[model samples]
Target chain A: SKEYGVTIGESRIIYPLDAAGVMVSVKNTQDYPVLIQSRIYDFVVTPPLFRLDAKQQNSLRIAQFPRDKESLKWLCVKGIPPVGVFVQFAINNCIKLLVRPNELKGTPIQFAENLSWKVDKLIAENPSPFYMNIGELTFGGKSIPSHYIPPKSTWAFDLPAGARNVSWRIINDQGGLDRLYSKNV
Target chain B: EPARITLTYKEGAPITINIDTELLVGTLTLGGYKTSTSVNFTDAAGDPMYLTFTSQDGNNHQFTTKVIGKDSDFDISPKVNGENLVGDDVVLATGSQDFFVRSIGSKGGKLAAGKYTDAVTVTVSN
Candidate 1:
């Protein structure tokens, strides 16, 4: 299956560490014309390469959007298949580039409600600057293998076998996916 | 096992925390499993347009399938609430759960045919 052509409306992008960069909007529903490509690992992409027209929509800029501290990369965005085109596939769009630290202390659902767990040493402590995207975390009934937490950091694991009740899953800012998030310990 | 007593709190003044205090956002969407409520909004929009269902984490998530050419241990299994999905990974449930796939034979043996394909690896994290 060919699957999809291209589209990136939005699905996670919180940039503003000091700001001077951020603009990604790639669309080309295909009529015929594409060669786009924009990468990210160290950042600095401005028209990395393009020709996307047919059903156009472009704007891929990222000057140095990594103010040194808060960042969580992934901004692929690809579409380059036309050497012979017999099924030389290339359909990409990762985008989840977060870099917010305007002085983080709130929002990101309050750093996931000021995370600080300890269901008997399973650990969790991200004092807040935002990066607690842990969706689906259980304790006592076990299951907390790696749950994220960075920005004051401290996240341990292994100490499961019932401590009580402490279910979890929180990934807001427009990336919902936990449609049992119980609590009580 | 019948027990559920939740209290949960936080009432203002810069002391907020919400893993369970009302902040359940939306959008999961997979498709193809719904007997039919037929809200019929037009050409697209099925499963009653999903209208945002709310809380539902039946707990189970581990997807990893393979087998697409050559080097074969022959495996392709992804049931829709049926389950034969062991260790190599295929667990589901946590919103917008609807799956389907067949051919669960050979841990690393037999049958060499023509059109054989398999692949599954779906993960969305924050």
Candidate 2:
């Protein structure tokens, strides 16, 4: 008796009003079938609720944000097994979304890295107008997965054990690695 | 000779996990586990400080937990059962699943002696 597992395409969604809409791919990578239920803020989740067989995938087309605002929201998706009447087991997962204005665009993206010798903390600053989807941080030969860094904000982390140097990589709205800022700490 | 025999077994107590609603790390801290209280305020020494948050697991069935910070700078250290928590999942078993969060200064210099607040999301998945 195994529960269903879900894999989301991206943690952040950038929906444009002029465009068709941002498409989020959801896949059920489990051995058993599961009924996937989702909720997308004020927008209705396409196929609001449906069932997916093992190894099946679906696309969640997220329309424009409630309004033009740089807000962070959670897109929650729950997977429940078809257990008779009452729901026996269900697991919930959430994806963070940074809804950006459709017309918002800027120069690729930029980052500033700060490393200190006296303390075990590393700071990454995003000076751009768009949120930076920082996927991982490589310091002293160790890779640490990190969350997205909002625009004009700084992302900091405790320097890894025995870490002397640090750098980072980020993904754009399309979920593509735009650049690998390998500059020295 | 008995035609049939019954096997007997007893289940242990239900898992009881207790985690403080909040924890505060004050200035001039020292590194290590502070179990005395949830709020810790150290001296003016330039040392990293940590707070030990406690939770009980009775089933001892080995559970895991992860600490997801609102930003990248905040983090949780060490392991719950035998796993490391850095935006990653960790294991927890029956008993007390204790962990710590160190006020690891900032990148440019030491952490400012101001009230630095961060909202962290911690989850235990059985």
Candidate 3:
């Protein structure tokens, strides 16, 4: 039987995104007990590392100070067994932290207008006051990555060959924000 | 003793909303449909929880279910609550509290002159 890898959610983590800080949970998909340790670039993770039993889940709370732009960090989760002589498997992941201004209580609503596909490029503008994080873009049945779109700015994605329809998921400025899904344009 | 959490739901079966009787419409009425249900949670006092309501179609349809109540409030606009429920989780209350569902105006033309049905799930989690 093949061993399953660790599961990470939503691709990235944002600090102060919620009252309880950034919450990320890791689940053990396999049938063996593994010790899990997390390494965040410049933040402190409660427990830093711990042991997870089989079919168990561990949730972590991560916090960091404010920053002008979103900071990129590599998160590596090394899962090791307690008694086996087997080699440890490390799950390497990257998560970005977007710390909103402390004074601003609410995030600006996002709007995408005049969305058009010219040849193989998808274009849109973040006309709202807040920054827009484009997580994933699906066009022509291909998945493309779109990292961040600053406020009052325009973003364009190079679509695949013969791409027709375009839909995307965006990480908005709101805390506890869900990925703005699929606006066919 | 181990601490245990139990959810005491007042309405065991699904509450069906009749468009003709339960839903108030027309010019003289409020034009919005309304319904109510209540639930109680044990062993989760002061623990933060939120009510997530989802429709079968996932916000594609015109009809919408908006949560209305005095004690319960949503972080985002109630209209989009069914799809993406985010922000600070609504704190859970211990006793019996009323949860209201108001059917707001729909762009699908008088909610589309037929029997329109949508399933909504109200979840309480910490």
Candidate 4:
């Protein structure tokens, strides 16, 4: 937030296919009123928009994961400054909404450790339906800058001369880093 | 009585800004000059986190500025944390950090005068 402007929040939401929904908080922590809104697609969101007075708070309810396939979309929570007020900075948030199949599933650790790999050309593929947020997607010591490896897709990395191994870490369901997994090329 | 297990964790939420990032230099002479504007790439999430900043192009890692009615273009490399951001792999601390950028000419040939501007796209990948 700008020095004297509105203050807001952040989150990364994951929904199961069977569950109804989830709740996220968006607050206005300034002494004046501000307009806060969260209208996102690729899933359903509630209220769409609102006006929060000084120190007012609200929670947004999100629901309905795509049943046909896994999904990932950004949820944008915007804070609009009051009209005619001279505000330098406004607070808003863009967080992730990850939806995957429910019920019988392996651990996120096993999903990362057991990804398909081929060392002949320094390539890897994620076979699981889960969205794996793998960090440091490096193969043959030369890494590629990537957000995450998409599920069921092969990511090719160029192999440097006489390179040895590929390693990476995972951003698990709890938003915590998992153990690093590496394999010799 | 039922005992409960609770889990708590911290991850930064990416933020949006209402201000337009325009390096508005009113007027300039036909040569080499630079003007800049400061923007706060804010992170007012409930927790603390470190986020990676990068060029939105995902390839060249540089912003290209073009002339109003000509084919000539130049590069405007951005700066953050006192480092040159020309690619897709720079990290910034998440509690509202300053995103400062300066506009400079990038053509190597002739000169044509008109109103020139470029839309810079910056990416924040967590």
Candidate 5:
């Protein structure tokens, strides 16, 4: 609130992307070192053509990758195992962590803050959300442990530590909303 | 009621003659209305002659044509009911029934020759 900073004690990030400053990850359990600066997000959709009225219409369902849907029902064949596209994250160089791309399971989410601690998880080796490109960005927030917030000891140290049920996949690639512009001071 | 019919021109060779038939005559005028008179052929300076109608009895009924000089007349109202077109002929193709002795000028070009007769009245009503 004093400009931002607080993720709750005990730092341990191993390699924060190799310094240089830029690793805004947040899932929960306190850990901070934020420097996000200028963040944004977007998603929009409407391109699933093949309407015989969609035949019997079940809307869509699919779950066969480790046998999803609790066991199986991956009858999904819309845009092809890909639909989540709502990535939003806004920052001002201090603190502002929000994530929701179906709780991110294409995994490659990592954040860090030191002087105390503020770390995020879901790093099998980075590459979720279309195999992630750079910084591996995503954010929305519906219901994942208070929607995500950390860095509350003057500036993060520890709070949200390791998983609860944050699974978002709203990457609706052409869905709508995600803009930010103000470059020249 | 006119059920009379007449149109002749077996075949002429150098002055314009092309007759292919199908259209009879009938109706004297009013009286429970039974009208049916047809003979649409043209040339000699009076246009409108492009005949084609085949419904011996399959129906596509809706007839009306006018061009009376070389001859033209057809009126089968009172809900269509007239017949008396004997020896009917004209099967050139593209559906059957066509005549253009020659002289179709202007991009259908062919100017000169003659043959087109008319007089028919075929009607039948209760």
Candidate 6:
């Protein structure tokens, strides 16, 4: 067999903090009838069962792993594996990740911890749609500007640091309500 | 490099031939009109010399056995109408595979060699 090269890219999962007992809610906004067709072209989508309608929201609540205080302890969405339960959007678009540290609390941990690298190897492998150059492709012979990059989603952290009881909230922005709320455990 | 030739045919045109890529270079007819065909390559001289032969009828017919180039690649862009229409853009990768219509049955046809061509213009690069 002839040799070949398979290229893969990386993506950023912008989040504020990582703690225990976090809940994330993802919802669809636009009335774009989308089907959760496990089409993980680059990176496979996770949670196995995920879907929502326009203005509807689904959430994920995660608990921190128990460990000694002041120790570098790690926590993730329980029951959700890192690779298999991969993150994905409800729509066919590049789903954005929304970070909500906690709810029912004050400001989130204002400082940054170890950068939480996104677990994406295949998600970045899917081929991108043909990108059009400004004033190159058009309709009815009218040139259309193509210098548009879709706006990324916004994240919010509702938890406070230094508190023993911590919670985590995160949302995968599929449509619009990609909101994540944090709170006390 | 294998000698190559390309002949453009305007969409909806009756028929067109490369004259240099026909199987039976001398046995083609149109509208019941018989004619001789031949195709040849240039020998250091830039002139339309004697080549092979090809024939065509005003139908959606393509000469398969007459194909002189192996690994022929064909790519198309967003059909006027189809699924996943990316809106008026076509891109095909260079050194890609080309599948055309060679065998067709009456009233039905098979997408013989996966006629699914990327609707994009892909230029070969170094």
- The most accurate candidate by lDDT is 4
Q: In model 1 chain A, where is the ten-residue run with the lowest total lDDT?
A: A83-92
DockQ agreement of candidate 5 with the native complex: 0.00
Better of 2 and 4 by DockQ: 4
TM-score of 4: 0.57
Q: Candidate 5 residues B1-126, lDDT tens each?
A: 111111122222322212212222111112111012222222222223422221123333212222111112222221111221322211111111122222222222222232222222211110
- Residue runs of model 2 more than 4 Å from their true location after superposition: A1-3, A7-12, A17-20, A23-32, A53-59, A65-70, A83-93, A107-120, A140-145, A161-164, B1-126
What does each candidate score in C-alpha RMSD?
20.0, 16.8, 20.0, 13.7, 37.0, 23.6
Best by TM-score: 4
B1-126 per-residue lDDT for model 4 (tens digits): 110111111211222222122332221111100011111133222111111222333332222221111011223222222233343332222232323222233223222322222222121223
How far off is residue A112 in model 6, in Å?
Answer: 14
User: TM-score (0 to 1) for chain A, all models?
Assistant: 0.34, 0.65, 0.57, 0.75, 0.15, 0.23
* Residue A39 miss distance in model 3 (angstroms): 2.1
- Tens-digit lDDT string for candidate 3 (A113-144): 32333443567666544456554466676655
TM-score of each: 0.29, 0.47, 0.40, 0.57, 0.12, 0.19
Question: lDDT order of candidates, best first?
Answer: 4, 1, 2, 3, 6, 5
Query: DockQ values for all predictions?
Result: 0.03, 0.03, 0.01, 0.05, 0.00, 0.02
- What are the per-residue Cα lDDT tens digits for candidate 1 across A74-153? 66666654500011234444446777767654566654656666655667777766676665677766654344566667
Interface RMSD of 4: 15.1
Q: Write the per-residue lDDT of candidate 5 for residues A1-185, one digit (tens) a residue.
A: 11111121111111111123223222111132222112122111122223212112212110112111111010111110010011111111111112223323332222211111123532222212222111112212122111112112121111222333222222122211123111110
Task: Give a tens-digit lDDT track for model 4, residues A104-181.
Answer: 366456788876668655677877666677644666666544455666677664443666677888777665677889
**Model 6 - which docking category?**
incorrect
**Candidate 2 residue lDDT tens string, A3-92:** 334566664465554456677777776677888788754265787789988888888777644333345666766665550001123444
Native-referenced DockQ of model 1: 0.03
- Positional deviation of residue B48's Cα in model 4 after best superposition, in angstroms: 31
List the global CA lDDT of all models: 0.44, 0.42, 0.40, 0.45, 0.20, 0.20
Interface RMSD of each: 22.6, 21.2, 21.0, 15.1, 45.1, 21.9
Which has the greatest DockQ? 4
